[PDB]
Design a protein around this ligand. Structure first.
Ligand SMILES: O=C1O[C@H]([C@@H](O)CO)C(O)=C1O
Ligand SMILES: O=C1O[C@H]([C@@H](O)CO)C(O)=C1O
Ligand SMILES: O=C1O[C@H]([C@@H](O)CO)C(O)=C1O
Ligand SMILES: O=C1O[C@H]([C@@H](O)CO)C(O)=C1O
Ligand SMILES: O=C1O[C@H]([C@@H](O)CO)C(O)=C1O
Ligand SMILES: O=C1O[C@H]([C@@H](O)CO)C(O)=C1O
Ligand SMILES: O=C1O[C@H]([C@@H](O)CO)C(O)=C1O
Ligand SMILES: O=C1O[C@H]([C@@H](O)CO)C(O)=C1O
Ligand SMILES: O=C1O[C@H]([C@@H](O)CO)C(O)=C1O
Lengths: 332, 332, 332
């Protein structure tokens, strides 16, 4: 028996008063689908003759192992965005412009403008502190081999007249010179000095100098003749003094050299030697001595003779004479 | 023919001894599903009258293009986590606190504590090396316009008596002064000096000074009168010396000024002029000269006369007399 | 009626000339599937007796909420890769090696090699600028408590003879000494000085010094005896001069001390005192005075007497005599 089932197009079914008997098959001609009547329900309400429940499907895809927008969105949210952040490269890029503690080269300038915790007294302060007590090198090497410059190598300046610290303080202990300035015979000489001092302060010596030499001078000066011409330097001196007036001045009465022992001293106050042998000096009591014949354009006020090698005085002479003339005058 | 098929609830089927003939339809009344008998298999083992194989489904979703947890987990694992890493901002945030080689402003302090490779002799060492041979600016500018300070602008100090380098070494070549200290007439003057030196070392001159001037003094001093009062500075001197004792001392015998030519010299050893004209001097042989009448509170030991303008000596006089008295005595 | 349907294996169906009548069921015996004839289409072209359209499935999975490779790939592309970027740690790791503006410790060296915008005149230049006008601390503290060192604490050097700036310039205003060097009595003394100057320049005083003291010397020297032995320092001097020759020299003619008032001065040019009381001096007109008896190994050229306390001259004496002898000669 070739059995054929009630049938019409889906849309036609979709509007049939036709109640399929229970378990009677009806057929959707334009789709080929079928449905079994429940004895009591319009065709468009019967379900299919076979399941359509995803659960019952063979060859299910693993949907479970697939990532979900949300899951993937949170997992992304923990991770940093390309620009919010610097490539290892831009990091170096910037880093290499910064000086390191271990050392570097400043092509630019290093201004310092200190806040001053305590300003740290005595050698654990100063904007630059340099402790070399465990190192064999220099503290601050500053040099130039330029031909001309517009400024000096180191300059110190204080602008307020109340300022009360030194510009340079040198507290030195060691076996060589505390401070050494050496100028080298130029090919080109100059008219300036190695150390030049200028003080406007009428209330304080431009340079003050104290020492406690056993066998040496507090200030020692040596003039080397710059040439081999013994007669070359006829005009150099070991020490030159000029007492002078204020530009636009009446004059000056300031003294030349002024020596003194406030404390008192047995030494020669002025001792002058040549070829390491005394030639003139002033004894501490103010007597003077000279190896060689002298001259006074002028007169010598002095005490009458007593010794034979004492100079005569008009008085002594006259009196010697006055005596002879008179004593002679057995011519009574 | 309205055909209806064997039928009972699924659960009822699920336990029927009823073997459906091959290709005979049976019907699950509570689900509407059907199944075809294979002539030999309990109903609950027949499959459906139509496929449920995901593969055969129309409107398949692209499951293939969906990301998978694993895939998405590895791809995430290559990407960096928000905090493990610094925002471009925190990067600057930190970076801007670091001094750069091109220059910056140190609001804080810069201690140096050197390790010392070699400690680098002669001008490619020192913790601070400053080469300005190609620049027209200063080396180290240090100034203050504060009114008071607790420390100096630069200080150098060495604490060990064996220390064997200078505190400041100045090797200078150029056309101006190697070192220049200038003090400016204060509104407020002080009692200190421009350059003050103090040495405790009894074995070395506090300041030693050598030069080879052709036509100039090794040490040159000029005293300017600070006022226009010619009689103002009655008490200044070009150079003042005080020879003095140790606080708590017997005395001192240390000399005042001590001059010498160890090598020997034809020059005036002491030459004193006024208005650029000789007034007193000591000849290199130790003869002295004076333009103006002099005085000795005291006596003058000297050699008998020879010239007419030589001073007389008690002896010479007496003998001249002794002669006349005697020669007169044609009074036989 | 047990109805059974046309049937053969799928593969057998798959090649049947058998046209199923419309809505007549045929059965795939090896699969259990069925199909309804459309009256006109070979069996292998009929579809199933029930849908296989993913859309119509109950228990649909949310495919919509699943992430897609592309979506997930772009969202990943915005996020940075682990190594392209530095962990907050490596960031510090590097950062901590860089000196900060607020302060740090340079274990290494800081060379400076300046480019020079303008080289900045007068106190807003120098590779190191240090302004302490608002701080109470030091400018540049450099010290060492090492025993020996190979270099100094600060050194300045200029290599070109045309160089035209100072090495150290000190423009000072304040109430204490501009520059202070102090050496402390060593346990170990040395033979060097506190300040040593050496100039090769025959065209410029090694040290030049100017000041305008009202009541003080431009250069003040004090020699303290280092011991309490009054007779200890028999050989120290306040100032020692040596005029000397060029190593390999004929001699020198350079003078010892050279004093002058170019401007002219009423002061004593040379005044020597002991226990703060004049003992010898040279009057500005070049007359000299001495408190104590003197001596000249030699002769004294001088002007005839006028006063009684003037020294006699051979001439004066002789003439006094020549007169008496002659005047006596009432012996006619
Ligand atoms: O007497 C001198 O002292 C210095 C130097 O030797 C001292 O460290 C020098 O060059 C002289 O001629
Ligand atoms: O005076 C100079 O210094 C160097 C060299 O002589 C250093 O001793 C040089 O070339 C000069 O002209
Ligand atoms: O002998 C010298 O003459 C000049 C100067 O005194 C001219 O007044 C000078 O510097 C000398 O050493
Ligand atoms: O003679 C002097 O030398 C200095 C300065 O001119 C030198 O560079 C100065 O101020 C003087 O009065
Ligand atoms: O002595 C001073 O320095 C400046 C100015 O005079 C600089 O020449 C100033 O105001 C002072 O009181
Ligand atoms: O003429 C002076 O008197 C004092 C001092 O010598 C007092 O002993 C001094 O410094 C002068 O220059
Ligand atoms: O007269 C002196 O000057 C210095 C110091 O007191 C000046 O700031 C010092 O130590 C002396 O003995
Ligand atoms: O000369 C020295 O300096 C210190 C201490 O005396 C400082 O006043 C020390 O231990 C020395 O040997
Ligand atoms: O009295 C002294 O003798 C030596 C020296 O003049 C030897 O020529 C010296 O330095 C002194 O102060």
């Amino acid at each position: 028996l070739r059995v054929q089932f009630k049938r019409m197009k889906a849309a036609e079914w979709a509007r049939s008063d036709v109640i399929l008997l229970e378990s009677e098959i009806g057929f959707e001609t334009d789709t080929g689908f079928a449905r079994a009547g429940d004895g009591h329900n319009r065709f468009s309400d019967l379900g299919y003759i076979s399941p359509l429940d995803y659960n019952l499907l063979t060859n299910k895809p693993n949907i479970d192992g697939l990532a979900t927008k949300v899951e993937t969105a949170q997992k992304l949210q923990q991770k940093a965005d390309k620009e919010t952040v610097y490539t290892k490269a831009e990091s170096k890029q910037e880093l290499d412009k910064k000086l390191n503690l271990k050392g570097g080269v400043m092509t630019g300038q290093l201004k310092f403008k200190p806040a001053a915790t305590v300003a740290y007294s005595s050698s654990t302060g100063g904007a630059v502190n340099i402790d070399l007590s465990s190192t064999r090198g220099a503290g601050v090497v500053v040099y130039s081999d330029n031909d001309t410059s517009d400024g000096p190598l180191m300059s110190l300046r204080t602008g307020k007249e109340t300022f009360n610290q030194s510009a340079l303080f040198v507290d030195y202990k060691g076996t060589t010179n505390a401070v050494n300035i050496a100028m080298r015979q130029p090919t080109t000489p100059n008219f300036s000095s190695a150390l030049n001092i200028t003080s406007g302060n009428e209330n304080g010596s431009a340079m003050q100098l104290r020492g406690s030499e056993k066998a040496l001078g507090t200030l020692k000066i040596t003039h080397e003749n710059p040439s081999i011409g013994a007669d070359y330097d006829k005009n150099a001196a070991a020490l030159s003094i000029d007492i002078v007036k204020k530009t636009n001045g009446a004059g000056t009465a300031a003294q030349g050299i002024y020596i003194n022992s406030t404390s008192g001293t047995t030494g020669k106050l002025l001792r002058i030697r040549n070829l390491s042998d005394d030639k003139f000096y002033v004894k501490s009591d103010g007597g003077f001595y000279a190896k060689e014949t002298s001259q006074i354009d002028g007169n010598l006020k002095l005490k009458d003779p007593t010794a034979n090698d004492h100079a005569a005085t008009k008085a002594y002479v006259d009196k010697a004479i006055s005596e002879l003339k008179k004593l002679i005058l057995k011519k009574h």
